[PDB]
């Protein structure tokens, strides 16, 4: 399938134990996609002071369309030193590995895979 329905656990930034997916734009996009497939991916909602608490490169989920079965269509965009790899709509949040942190909420998304 080109798209996969996922429910992403929303994590508080200060709970997150692994604050990024790796060390290159290509690696973080690769790792984020693997974790999304394996159900081991969390979402941190971006506010003032969140991103500097996470590791670059960042992986964002961004709205790709204006929401089948409640699931917002999203795609992945990475960022490193203020340059983004991809082009898409509004940020729903930043992806991080999920290693058992307790979520505050779930974000239903339809991921272009």
Coordinates of N, CA, C and O in Angstrom, one line a residue:
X1 N 0.9 -1.2 0.0 CA 0.0 0.0 0.0 C 0.9 1.2 0.0 O 1.8 1.3 0.8
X2 N 0.5 2.3 -0.8 CA 1.2 3.6 -0.8 C 1.0 4.3 0.5 O 1.8 5.2 0.8
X3 N -0.1 4.0 1.2 CA -0.4 4.7 2.5 C -0.8 3.7 3.6 O -1.4 2.7 3.2
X4 N -0.4 4.0 4.8 CA -0.6 3.1 6.0 C -1.2 4.0 7.1 O -0.7 5.1 7.4
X5 N -2.3 3.5 7.7 CA -3.0 4.1 8.8 C -2.2 3.8 10.1 O -1.9 2.6 10.3
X6 N -1.8 4.8 10.8 CA -1.0 4.7 12.0 C -1.6 5.6 13.1 O -2.2 6.6 12.8
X7 N -1.5 5.1 14.4 CA -1.9 5.9 15.6 C -0.6 6.1 16.3 O 0.0 5.1 16.9
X8 N 0.0 7.3 16.3 CA 1.3 7.7 16.9 C 1.1 8.1 18.3 O 0.4 9.0 18.5
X9 N 1.9 7.5 19.3 CA 1.9 8.0 20.6 C 2.5 9.3 20.7 O 3.6 9.5 20.2
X10 N 1.8 10.3 21.3 CA 2.3 11.7 21.5 C 3.1 11.7 22.8 O 2.5 11.4 23.9
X11 N 4.4 12.1 22.8 CA 5.3 12.0 24.0 C 5.6 13.5 24.4 O 5.7 14.3 23.5
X12 N 5.7 13.7 25.7 CA 6.2 15.0 26.2 C 7.7 15.0 25.9 O 8.4 13.9 26.2
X13 N 8.3 16.1 25.5 CA 9.7 16.2 25.1 C 10.6 15.8 26.2 O 11.6 15.0 26.0
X14 N 10.3 16.1 27.5 CA 11.2 15.8 28.7 C 11.2 14.3 29.0 O 12.1 13.9 29.8
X15 N 10.2 13.5 28.5 CA 10.1 12.0 28.7 C 11.0 11.3 27.7 O 11.4 10.1 28.0
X16 N 11.3 11.9 26.6 CA 11.9 11.2 25.5 C 13.3 10.7 25.8 O 14.1 11.6 26.2
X17 N 13.5 9.4 25.7 CA 14.8 8.8 26.0 C 15.8 8.8 24.8 O 17.0 9.0 25.1
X18 N 15.3 8.7 23.6 CA 16.2 8.6 22.4 C 15.7 9.8 21.6 O 14.5 9.7 21.0
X19 N 16.5 10.8 21.5 CA 16.0 12.2 21.0 C 16.2 12.4 19.5 O 16.0 13.5 19.1
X20 N 16.5 11.3 18.8 CA 16.6 11.4 17.3 C 16.9 10.1 16.7 O 17.1 9.1 17.5
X21 N 16.9 10.0 15.4 CA 17.0 8.7 14.7 C 18.4 8.5 14.1 O 18.7 7.4 13.6
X22 N 19.3 9.4 14.2 CA 20.7 9.2 13.7 C 21.3 10.5 13.3 O 20.9 11.6 13.8
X23 N 22.2 10.4 12.4 CA 23.3 11.4 12.2 C 23.4 12.0 10.8 O 24.2 12.9 10.6
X24 N 22.5 11.6 9.9 CA 22.4 12.2 8.5 C 20.9 12.3 8.2 O 20.1 11.5 8.8
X25 N 20.6 13.2 7.2 CA 19.2 13.4 6.7 C 18.7 12.0 6.2 O 17.6 11.6 6.5
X26 N 19.6 11.3 5.4 CA 19.2 10.0 4.8 C 18.9 9.0 5.9 O 18.0 8.2 5.8
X27 N 19.8 9.0 6.9 CA 19.6 7.9 8.0 C 18.4 8.2 8.8 O 17.7 7.3 9.2
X28 N 18.1 9.5 9.2 CA 17.0 9.8 10.1 C 15.7 9.5 9.3 O 14.8 8.9 9.9
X29 N 15.6 9.8 8.0 CA 14.4 9.5 7.2 C 14.2 8.0 7.1 O 13.1 7.5 7.2
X30 N 15.3 7.2 6.9 CA 15.3 5.7 6.8 C 14.8 5.1 8.1 O 13.9 4.3 8.1
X31 N 15.5 5.5 9.2 CA 15.1 5.0 10.6 C 13.7 5.4 10.9 O 13.0 4.5 11.4
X32 N 13.3 6.6 10.7 CA 11.9 7.1 11.0 C 10.9 6.1 10.3 O 10.0 5.6 10.9
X33 N 11.1 5.9 9.0 CA 10.3 5.0 8.1 C 10.3 3.6 8.7 O 9.2 3.0 8.9
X34 N 11.4 3.1 9.1 CA 11.5 1.7 9.7 C 10.7 1.7 11.0 O 9.9 0.7 11.2
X35 N 10.8 2.7 11.9 CA 10.1 2.7 13.2 C 8.6 2.9 13.0 O 7.8 2.3 13.7
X36 N 8.2 3.7 12.0 CA 6.8 3.9 11.7 C 6.2 2.6 11.3 O 5.1 2.2 11.8
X37 N 6.9 1.8 10.4 CA 6.4 0.4 10.0 C 6.4 -0.5 11.2 O 5.4 -1.3 11.3
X38 N 7.3 -0.4 12.1 CA 7.5 -1.4 13.3 C 6.6 -1.0 14.5 O 6.6 -1.7 15.5
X39 N 5.9 0.1 14.4 CA 5.1 0.7 15.5 C 5.9 1.1 16.7 O 5.4 1.0 17.8
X40 N 7.1 1.6 16.4 CA 8.1 2.0 17.5 C 8.5 3.4 17.3 O 9.6 3.8 17.6
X41 N 7.5 4.3 16.9 CA 7.8 5.7 16.5 C 6.8 6.6 17.3 O 5.6 6.3 17.3
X42 N 7.4 7.6 18.0 CA 6.5 8.5 18.8 C 6.5 9.9 18.1 O 7.3 10.1 17.1
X43 N 5.7 10.8 18.5 CA 5.5 12.1 18.0 C 5.6 13.1 19.1 O 4.9 12.9 20.1
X44 N 6.4 14.1 18.9 CA 6.5 15.3 19.9 C 5.9 16.5 19.2 O 6.4 16.8 18.1
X45 N 4.9 17.1 19.8 CA 4.3 18.3 19.2 C 5.2 19.5 19.4 O 5.8 19.6 20.6
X46 N 5.4 20.3 18.4 CA 6.5 21.3 18.4 C 5.9 22.6 19.0 O 4.8 23.0 18.5
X47 N 6.5 23.0 20.1 CA 6.3 24.4 20.6 C 7.6 25.0 21.0 O 8.7 24.3 20.8
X48 N 7.6 26.3 21.3 CA 8.7 27.1 21.8 C 9.5 26.2 22.8 O 8.9 25.7 23.7
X49 N 10.8 25.9 22.4 CA 11.8 25.3 23.2 C 11.8 23.8 23.1 O 12.7 23.1 23.8
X50 N 11.0 23.2 22.3 CA 11.0 21.7 22.1 C 12.2 21.3 21.2 O 12.9 20.4 21.6
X51 N 12.3 21.9 20.0 CA 13.3 21.4 19.0 C 14.8 21.4 19.6 O 15.5 20.5 19.4
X52 N 15.2 22.5 20.4 CA 16.5 22.5 20.9 C 16.7 21.4 22.0 O 17.9 21.1 22.2
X53 N 15.7 20.8 22.5 CA 15.8 19.6 23.4 C 15.9 18.3 22.6 O 16.1 17.3 23.2
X54 N 15.8 18.3 21.3 CA 15.9 17.1 20.4 C 17.2 17.2 19.6 O 17.8 18.3 19.6
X55 N 17.6 16.1 19.0 CA 18.8 15.9 18.2 C 18.5 16.1 16.8 O 17.5 15.5 16.3
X56 N 19.3 16.9 16.1 CA 19.3 17.0 14.6 C 20.1 15.9 14.0 O 21.0 15.3 14.7
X57 N 19.9 15.5 12.8 CA 18.8 16.0 12.0 C 17.4 15.6 12.6 O 17.3 14.5 13.1
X58 N 16.4 16.5 12.4 CA 15.0 16.3 12.8 C 14.2 15.6 11.7 O 14.5 15.8 10.5
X59 N 13.2 14.8 12.0 CA 12.2 14.3 11.1 C 10.9 14.8 11.5 O 10.4 14.5 12.6
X60 N 10.2 15.6 10.6 CA 8.9 16.1 10.8 C 7.9 15.2 10.1 O 8.2 14.7 9.0
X61 N 6.7 15.1 10.6 CA 5.4 14.8 9.8 C 4.7 16.1 9.6 O 4.5 16.9 10.5
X62 N 4.4 16.3 8.3 CA 3.7 17.5 7.7 C 2.5 17.0 6.9 O 2.5 16.0 6.3
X63 N 1.4 17.8 7.1 CA 0.1 17.5 6.4 C 0.3 17.6 4.9 O 0.9 18.6 4.4
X64 N -0.1 16.6 4.2 CA 0.2 16.5 2.7 C -1.1 16.7 2.0 O -1.1 16.7 0.7
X65 N -2.3 17.0 2.7 CA -3.6 17.1 2.1 C -4.6 17.6 3.1 O -4.3 17.5 4.3
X66 N -5.7 18.2 2.6 CA -6.8 18.8 3.5 C -8.1 18.0 3.3 O -8.5 17.8 2.1
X67 N -8.9 13.7 5.2 CA -8.5 13.0 6.4 C -9.2 11.7 6.6 O -10.1 11.5 7.4
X68 N -8.9 10.7 5.7 CA -9.7 9.4 5.7 C -9.8 8.7 7.1 O -8.8 8.5 7.7
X69 N -11.0 8.4 7.5 CA -11.3 7.7 8.7 C -10.8 8.4 10.0 O -10.5 7.6 10.9
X70 N -10.6 9.7 9.9 CA -10.0 10.5 11.0 C -8.5 10.7 10.8 O -7.9 11.6 11.5
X71 N -7.8 9.9 10.0 CA -6.4 9.9 9.8 C -5.9 11.0 8.8 O -6.3 10.9 7.6
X72 N -5.2 12.0 9.3 CA -4.6 13.1 8.6 C -3.5 12.5 7.7 O -2.7 11.8 8.2
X73 N -3.5 12.9 6.4 CA -2.5 12.5 5.5 C -1.2 13.3 5.7 O -1.3 14.5 5.8
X74 N -0.1 12.6 5.9 CA 1.2 13.3 6.3 C 2.3 12.7 5.4 O 2.0 11.6 4.8
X75 N 3.4 13.4 5.3 CA 4.6 12.9 4.7 C 5.8 13.4 5.6 O 5.6 14.3 6.4
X76 N 6.9 12.8 5.4 CA 8.2 13.0 6.1 C 9.0 14.1 5.5 O 9.2 14.0 4.2
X77 N 9.5 15.1 6.2 CA 10.5 16.1 5.8 C 11.6 16.2 6.9 O 11.2 16.4 8.1
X78 N 12.8 16.0 6.5 CA 14.0 16.1 7.5 C 14.5 17.5 7.5 O 14.4 18.3 6.4
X79 N 15.2 17.9 8.6 CA 15.8 19.2 8.7 C 17.2 19.1 9.4 O 17.3 18.3 10.4
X80 N 18.2 19.8 8.9 CA 19.6 19.8 9.4 C 20.1 21.2 9.1 O 20.1 21.6 7.9
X81 N 20.5 21.9 10.2 CA 21.1 23.3 10.2 C 20.3 24.2 9.3 O 20.9 24.9 8.4
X82 N 19.0 24.1 9.4 CA 18.0 25.1 8.9 C 17.6 24.8 7.4 O 16.9 25.5 6.8
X83 N 18.1 23.6 6.9 CA 17.7 23.1 5.5 C 16.9 21.9 5.7 O 17.2 20.9 6.4
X84 N 15.7 21.9 4.9 CA 14.7 20.9 4.9 C 14.8 20.1 3.6 O 15.2 20.7 2.5
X85 N 14.6 18.8 3.7 CA 14.7 17.8 2.6 C 13.3 17.3 2.4 O 12.8 16.5 3.2
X86 N 12.6 17.8 1.4 CA 11.2 17.7 1.2 C 10.5 19.0 1.3 O 11.0 20.0 1.9
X87 N 9.2 19.0 0.9 CA 8.4 20.1 0.9 C 7.0 19.6 1.1 O 6.6 18.6 0.4
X88 N 6.2 20.1 2.1 CA 4.9 19.6 2.5 C 4.2 20.7 3.3 O 4.8 21.8 3.4
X89 N 3.0 20.4 3.9 CA 2.2 21.4 4.6 C 2.7 21.6 6.0 O 3.8 21.4 6.3
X90 N 1.7 21.9 6.9 CA 2.0 22.3 8.3 C 2.5 21.1 9.1 O 2.0 19.9 8.9
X91 N 3.4 21.4 10.0 CA 4.1 20.4 10.9 C 3.0 19.9 11.9 O 2.4 20.7 12.6
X92 N 2.8 18.5 12.0 CA 2.0 17.9 13.1 C 2.9 17.6 14.3 O 2.4 17.5 15.4
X93 N 4.2 17.4 14.0 CA 5.2 17.3 15.1 C 6.5 16.7 14.6 O 6.7 16.5 13.4
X94 N 7.4 16.4 15.5 CA 8.7 15.8 15.2 C 8.7 14.3 15.7 O 8.1 14.0 16.8
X95 N 9.2 13.4 14.9 CA 9.2 12.0 15.2 C 10.4 11.7 16.0 O 11.5 12.3 15.7
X96 N 10.3 10.7 16.9 CA 11.4 10.2 17.7 C 11.1 8.7 17.9 O 10.0 8.2 17.8
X97 N 12.2 7.9 18.2 CA 12.0 6.5 18.6 C 11.1 6.5 19.9 O 11.2 7.5 20.7
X98 N 10.2 5.5 19.9 CA 9.4 5.2 21.1 C 10.0 3.9 21.7 O 10.0 2.9 21.1
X99 N 10.4 4.0 23.0 CA 11.0 2.9 23.7 C 10.3 2.7 25.0 O 10.9 2.2 25.9
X100 N 9.0 3.0 25.1 CA 8.1 2.7 26.3 C 7.7 3.9 27.1 O 7.0 3.7 28.1
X101 N 8.0 5.1 26.7 CA 7.5 6.3 27.3 C 6.0 6.3 27.3 O 5.4 5.7 26.3
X102 N 5.3 6.8 28.4 CA 3.8 6.9 28.4 C 3.4 8.1 27.6 O 3.8 9.2 27.9
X103 N 2.5 7.9 26.6 CA 2.0 9.0 25.9 C 1.0 9.8 26.6 O 0.4 9.4 27.6
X104 N 0.8 11.1 26.1 CA -0.3 12.0 26.6 C -1.5 11.9 25.7 O -2.6 12.3 26.1
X105 N -1.3 11.3 24.5 CA -2.4 11.3 23.5 C -1.9 10.4 22.3 O -0.7 10.0 22.3
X106 N -2.8 10.2 21.3 CA -2.5 9.5 20.1 C -2.9 10.4 18.9 O -3.9 11.1 19.0
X107 N -2.0 10.5 17.9 CA -2.3 11.2 16.6 C -2.5 10.2 15.5 O -1.5 9.6 15.1
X108 N -3.7 10.1 15.0 CA -4.1 9.2 13.9 C -3.6 9.9 12.6 O -3.9 11.1 12.4
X109 N -2.8 9.2 11.8 CA -2.2 9.8 10.6 C -2.3 8.7 9.5 O -2.4 7.4 9.9
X110 N -2.4 9.1 8.3 CA -2.2 8.3 7.0 C -0.9 8.6 6.4 O -0.7 9.7 5.9
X111 N 0.1 7.7 6.6 CA 1.5 7.9 6.1 C 1.7 7.5 4.7 O 1.6 6.3 4.4
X112 N 2.0 8.5 3.8 CA 2.6 8.2 2.4 C 3.9 7.4 2.7 O 4.9 8.0 3.2
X113 N 3.9 6.1 2.3 CA 5.0 5.2 2.5 C 5.7 4.9 1.1 O 5.1 5.3 0.1

